[PDB]
């Protein structure tokens, strides 16, 4: 089918607001004497040196 009316600004924006990113949950990891923030998912990899922290 095809949109019959132009969607109003209010509806367009109400439903567009749902397209949002979720900020990652960052935990502290100590590497090379420095305290970096990495996802708890990558916590182990960062400890083992498998995360490129630049």
């Amino acid at each position: 089918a095809v949109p019959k009316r132009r969607m109003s600004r209010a509806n367009t924006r109400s439903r567009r607001a749902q397209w949002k990113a979720e900020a990652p949950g960052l935990v502290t990891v100590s590497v090379a004497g420095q305290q970096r923030k990495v996802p708890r998912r990558l916590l182990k990899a960062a400890r083992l040196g498998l995360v490129d922290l630049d």
């Binding site: 397209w19 949002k20 990113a21 990652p24 960052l26 923030k37 990495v38 996802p39 630049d54």
Partner: protein, 114 residues
Amino acid sequence: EFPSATAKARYVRVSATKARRVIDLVRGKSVEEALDILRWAPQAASEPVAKVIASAAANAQNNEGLDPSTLVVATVYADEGPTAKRIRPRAQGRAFRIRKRTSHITVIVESRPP
């Protein structure tokens, strides 16, 4: 007024909306937290946003002589810049329009005392 530093990444090859998707994540946060969130954000638009935020922080540090630890992402927004028009051919020889949109990502980091 808090001492502020500006940084504008103009004509970024990302949609204004897709830049805003991560600017929303890192608006209001400190500079360090913003850069961490943009480091670990899976959205590709986080890289131009991170670069412009870091440029604002560097301007605050060097041109303004502000303490980087006290910086905070005060006002950040992505406006839509120029849009190039491309043609994609479709069935029955019909040409649909494709919009290669750009974005101007403006950042203003203030030095606030926690």
